[PDB]
Design an enzyme around this catalytic site. Structure first.
Site, PDB file in Angstrom:
ATOM      1  N   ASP C 245      37.502  28.142  30.690  1.00 48.42           N
ATOM      2  CA  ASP C 245      37.352  29.118  29.650  1.00 48.42           C
ATOM      3  C   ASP C 245      36.578  29.526  28.783  1.00 48.42           C
ATOM      4  O   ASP C 245      35.286  28.447  29.038  1.00 48.42           O
ATOM      5  CB  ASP C 245      38.500  28.725  29.007  1.00 48.42           C
ATOM      6  CG  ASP C 245      37.971  27.287  27.722  1.00 48.42           C
ATOM      7  OD1 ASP C 245      37.724  27.229  27.441  1.00 48.42           O
ATOM      8  OD2 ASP C 245      39.498  27.241  26.686  1.00 48.42           O
ATOM      9  N   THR C 246      36.185  30.289  28.145  1.00 44.38           N
ATOM     10  CA  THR C 246      35.309  30.685  27.129  1.00 44.38           C
ATOM     11  C   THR C 246      35.754  31.918  26.822  1.00 44.38           C
ATOM     12  O   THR C 246      36.802  32.423  27.007  1.00 44.38           O
ATOM     13  CB  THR C 246      34.105  31.087  27.637  1.00 44.38           C
ATOM     14  OG1 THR C 246      32.809  31.141  27.021  1.00 44.38           O
ATOM     15  CG2 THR C 246      33.873  32.082  28.911  1.00 44.38           C
ATOM     16  N   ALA C 247      35.366  31.925  25.335  1.00 45.05           N
ATOM     17  CA  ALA C 247      35.055  32.791  24.498  1.00 45.05           C
ATOM     18  C   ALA C 247      34.979  34.300  25.607  1.00 45.05           C
ATOM     19  O   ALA C 247      35.553  35.311  25.660  1.00 45.05           O
ATOM     20  CB  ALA C 247      33.745  32.808  23.223  1.00 45.05           C
ATOM     21  N   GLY C 295      42.722  38.153  27.513  1.00 43.69           N
ATOM     22  CA  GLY C 295      43.016  38.472  25.952  1.00 43.69           C
ATOM     23  C   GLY C 295      41.711  37.895  25.162  1.00 43.69           C
ATOM     24  O   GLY C 295      41.539  37.188  25.127  1.00 43.69           O
ATOM     25  N   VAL C 296      41.191  38.932  24.650  1.00 37.67           N
ATOM     26  CA  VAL C 296      40.239  38.477  23.534  1.00 37.67           C
ATOM     27  C   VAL C 296      39.798  39.333  22.754  1.00 37.67           C
ATOM     28  O   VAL C 296      39.515  40.181  22.636  1.00 37.67           O
ATOM     29  CB  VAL C 296      38.626  38.992  24.282  1.00 37.67           C
ATOM     30  CG1 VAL C 296      37.082  38.975  23.516  1.00 37.67           C
ATOM     31  CG2 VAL C 296      38.622  38.463  25.028  1.00 37.67           C
ATOM     32  N   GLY C 297      39.813  38.884  20.884  1.00 36.25           N
ATOM     33  CA  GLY C 297      40.451  39.557  19.455  1.00 36.25           C
ATOM     34  C   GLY C 297      41.374  40.407  20.321  1.00 36.25           C
ATOM     35  O   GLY C 297      41.164  41.371  20.371  1.00 36.25           O
ATOM     36  N   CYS C 302      42.125  40.274  13.336  1.00 36.49           N
ATOM     37  CA  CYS C 302      41.868  38.917  13.611  1.00 36.49           C
ATOM     38  C   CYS C 302      40.166  38.380  12.845  1.00 36.49           C
ATOM     39  O   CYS C 302      39.460  39.455  13.078  1.00 36.49           O
ATOM     40  CB  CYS C 302      41.604  38.552  14.916  1.00 36.49           C
ATOM     41  SG  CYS C 302      40.808  39.513  16.129  1.00 36.49           S
TER      42      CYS C 302
END
Lengths: 469, 469, 469, 99
Positions: C245-247, C295-297, C302
């Site tokens: 995983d990562t941003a 799913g990113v932001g 948020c």
């Protein structure tokens, strides 16, 4: 239905997305509009009371039937209780309302409790069938808590014979200190009471009666067990309308139940639901249902649409279901969340022949729930406060504790939603007047004399959400 | 009207959905813009006061006529009161304002009450027609509550002859402790007062006057009874404009009333409403109405749109009505809910020749309502506080109590909406300055010297509701 | 996926923009639905616990594995701790739950602290492996703060042999004063405990087990350093699933890490993320990832979408990623913000084979965070309260203070979001029951027996924002 | 405090607080049937007819018994009320540990 030019949204519409455009009208006043339905339910107004335990009461049934509506009884009630309720309702007068009767030597606390059970505001004292007096508000203040009723009685009630034209009864109450007109039978026995507002409503409204000249009433049946036996028992009990309801009407079990009930050929109109699709409405009508119930999770933040993603906006669903049903010759009922007359007006304009009201009528005197006061003495009634106990009284079905716990593990507990009593609209008749005034104003603005004409000539528009800022 | 490329929504637009795109402009300042209307009403500003009992006062009529607007009188007033109001208004000066006059030996409480009836802030003491002094604020503090006026008088008022150029009157008030300039007639009798702000407004604004050089005023008539007789009586009384109003203008009764009034050929411009459709506007103009009133339930949460589903967003309705009326040679008036100068600017850009202001002007000194203070001494006036009593004074129509109760059963009681007085804009002249500044800034941004040019070159855009988060 | 006719918006959709239209259904009840996934993770429910330090605990791992889910361990944990956690989890029973064991002569404060670490509500006293009693609530009230445990013990616990059918264990607890069933091994040693609700869940749910019949568990690896060495160490430790995983998953470094880990051919399914684009999903799958994290932001307000403009609505991103991945034979996981069962239901309907839950499970007993009470004694746990210290324990990487400060200058400090404990749903099993009930109700409304069928027959609609007014 | 059957539950609640015993005996044909105690009216219908929440679990001793043994008989009783009846079975009075 007809929309404005270019108003073709890419989404389903709710009651907040639509508006009615005024057209050319020749209706002089609100009173020149006929609100009688054509769905076969026999109601003179499009108001129907939902079959919920906290709303569908006996006094509510009587009042709504006298004012032109109909009430569906809960499906969990025993056959004896339903028969007793039907016999009591069909033994009521078409004009006068049944008052609160107090026998002598009763407790004064019981009299105070009985005072708030109806909107008359005065409870008649009856002995040997003869009225003696009316107990009104503030009569229990300062008096001994163990008073025996026949100690603060006020024998100053206006009396008129039964059958008197309410026009003169209104005049007789012009200077009376209490707006209650106790009318007695020619033998002197008590028959009922009347009031100025009640006389006006009797002259305005038309009671919904059966072929025998008695008030109409409806009952509901569950989807479990032998549906045919329950339907036959309710038809023998004198019910004028049967409603087969469930959370999801578009299922095979409901189709089987409809086929079983329709096979008996009881002759009564049949109501089934709920569906929010044209296919579901067509399937329900084909199975043998004459009236289709519409509305499954109408709210965008309701419990159903938060537990699941299942739902549909009420307006589009009602429009589609009515369009599908009318070609098959059926009718649809709006079973969404109604809290304003705008909702009823838009549902009638969409094509619905009747609009059912649920929790909104729970905050009235005629509701079966008991009246209790908040810390600030706010009159309110606990919705679903005792319906859960009545729901599990039949949900147990003789199953073991293991099966009951296994069923209840997945079940979500419905919370008790407090509903404050409206001081200016405590009685359900005031809410009925409000809703009928809204519908009549809608009809006058559109320019229609009856509900089919309103649906025929209605022109709708679409508005954005920026107007709610 | 012209919109941006691709801005074609599938819904009707409100004032929150549109914005004005700046164009190339050569207007140097706000003062280089002419705000005179071309609808025939004779107003030099597009501001019109609504015919509501709590707003349409005599002092309000005088002030608005002097500042370039017009006020429509309520239709429930008797002919004698309307004649008296017209005679008083048409006997006022075009520059000076009528001050509050106090006779000697009057009660000091009456003087304090009269002090707040106008925005001057000083009430002149007059004896034999000669000014003696000015009673100002805090003069009643600590003084006996039964003072006889001529005990705290301050005979230190600046005096100038009537007809003096306000440019020098402004200079005379540079160092005066009270910003009131009492000007007396050459015989020494009182004629009026002036102030620095009043002198500036007199030099900026142009009074709306008739052919006789007197302040203009308007009156309204109901849709019931002999409309022709009332119209003739008001025309004989000196009214310069007739407005026939109702909740739903697109009805046969209003068409008959328009035909009856136009048959008399009184020569006055005629205003009718309200409609929100092109067909309604065309029907009203064809019947004989020169000005069409626009706006029926403009708000998305208003009482009309909660009772019924009837309504329409104000912007789209005004645009459509103006487009329909201009080809027939008529004019439209915006009769929505105006609370900001943006609403007036957008209504003028849409094509409306005049914008009528309703409850917004009720929170001013010049409004007929009496001033009262909240618990925190907040200055406010009770809107519809006494209009209901005046409404039922003519609603009774000699009908019996039975008929009155039957009518009032369906009627919904309008609540008394408290409107706080703006401390910085207590007078209606401040609100007029605010609105005119907004409109002038709109005109300068667009690049137009007059309202028709503003409507010609205006370019609009559409915005989503996500910008209000 | 299939949408309604004409529902083609010009924007990306969130979970508040969509709704599920009921279809024809033949599913009798909620229990007739199979929730087993087909993504290869081995979970019998679509619930996955996020790899966050404040949620991914050992007790949480055990409970979720027994109830049919899976938990991913944080990537910052040392290999020894991960090995110990895996050994403890894979040594647990498939039916009974590990109770809180208290040795004699311990501090009573320690017993009170250990009482709240699990949802059983009773801590067993064990000596020589034999149960002696259960310490329950209010046992420490009034007792000396220095009590030695074996002074308030209650030796009144129901005992049953291990392997007894929970059907009879439920009956044995019908009249017991404490809803705890301590079951001991045939030699009399303690093995675990059971409860009525636990017995029902054991009969309803199916534990997720590996090929050896032991509870499954997952672990995560960072994107820095030798990814292959960490992957090999975790595979040797007994991990059943690896998550990288990562941003921002759609970067070259993540592709290199995927290629390095897949080159080892460990045979375990691989999860990578996060991407919200079809191109990113295709690139991740081609590199060697079997499961793509989506799913990113997702939120519109948020922290990620306020710091930057980078983001995407969850529903559209999940739909696109699933559509891209299914043709390549891969699977997608929803890694958005889940706070209601509606989110999980909509994610499953969109095409996701699993839905991961993050901070929502932090407010439970089984979470590794310590329980603390607010001023009003509100049970809550500080999310990210101690995760920052654990994050910087590995973030230091032996770099100097200058490098650490240079890194932390741009870094934004995540705030500690208080999450109140739900009194009715204190245990994570209650939340699991809530979510599974929501998903089962969704399946029954749609008319599907399993998740692929639900995705196949789901019909969706679009709603406007005006319904939220 | 004696309550006849078919009486109002509100009257029973009012009569409960008229004495310090804390339990009102239900009597029919002169025979005790039960004791209505506190919290019995909570949640129950406000129009209850007394003989719907009765608790027939009262300790009984003959009249004339030495209170020394009556105290012992009330050692483990859940309600500190000892209803004593006449030799013909008719109600005569009550007793308690403190009494």
């Amino acid at each position: 239905v007809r929309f404005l030019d270019g108003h073709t949204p890419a989404y389903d519409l709710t009651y907040n997305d639509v508006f009615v455009v005024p057209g050319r009208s020749d209706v002089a006043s609100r009173f020149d509009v006929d609100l009688s339905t054509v769905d076969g339910s026999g109601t003179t107004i499009p108001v129907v009371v939902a079959n919920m335990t906290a709303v569908a009461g006996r006094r509510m049934a009587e009042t709504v039937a006298r004012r032109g509506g109909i009430v569906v009884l809960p499906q969990d009630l025993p056959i004896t209780a339903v028969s007793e309720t039907v016999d009591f309702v069909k033994s009521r007068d078409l004009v006068v309302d049944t008052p609160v009767t107090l026998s002598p030597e009763d407790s004064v606390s019981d009299a105070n409790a009985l005072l708030h059970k109806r909107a008359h505001g005065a409870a008649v004292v009856v002995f040997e069938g003869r009225p003696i007096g009316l107990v009104t508000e503030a009569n229990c203040a300062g008096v001994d808590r163990f008073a025996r009723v026949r100690d603060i009685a006020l024998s100053d009630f206006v009396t008129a014979p039964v059958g008197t034209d309410p026009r003169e009864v209104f005049d007789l109450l012009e200077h009376a200190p209490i707006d209650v007109a106790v009318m007695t039978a020619p033998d002197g026995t008590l028959a009922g009471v009347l009031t100025r507002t009640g006389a006006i409503r009797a002259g305005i409204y038309t009671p919904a009666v059966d072929a025998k000249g008695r008030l109409r009433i409806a009952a509901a049946v569950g989807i479990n067990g032998d549906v045919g036996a329950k339907a036959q028992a309710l038809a023998e009990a004198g019910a004028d309308l049967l409603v087969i309801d469930t959370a999801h009407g578009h299922q095979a079990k409901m189709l089987d139940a409809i086929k079983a009930v329709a096979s008996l050929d009881l002759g009564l109109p049949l109501v089934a639901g709920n569906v929010v699709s044209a296919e579901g409405t067509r399937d329900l009508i084909e199975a043998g249902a004459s009236i289709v119930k519409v509305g499954v999770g109408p709210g965008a933040m309701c419990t159903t649409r938060m537990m699941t993603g299942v739902g549909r906006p009420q307006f589009s669903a009602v429009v589609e279901c009515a369009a599908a049903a009318r070609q098959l010759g059926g009718h649809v009922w709006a079973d969404g969340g109604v809290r304003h007359p705008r909702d009823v007006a838009l549902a009638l304009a969409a094509g619905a022949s009747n609009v059912m009201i649920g929790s909104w009528f729970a905050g009235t005197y005629e509701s079966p729930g008991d009246l209790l006061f908040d810390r600030d003495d706010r009159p309110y009634k606990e919705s679903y406060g005792m319906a859960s106990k009545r729901a599990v009284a039949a949900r147990t079905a003789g199953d073991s504790s293991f099966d009951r716990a296994r069923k209840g593990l997945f079940e979500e507990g419905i919370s008790t939603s407090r509903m404050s009593l409206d001081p200016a609209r405590g009685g359900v008749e005031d809410l009925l007047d409000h809703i009928t005034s809204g519908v009549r104003s809608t009809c006058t603005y559109v320019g229609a004399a009856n509900l089919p004409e309103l649906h025929e000539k209605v022109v709708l528009g679409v508005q954005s959400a920026a107007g709610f800022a």
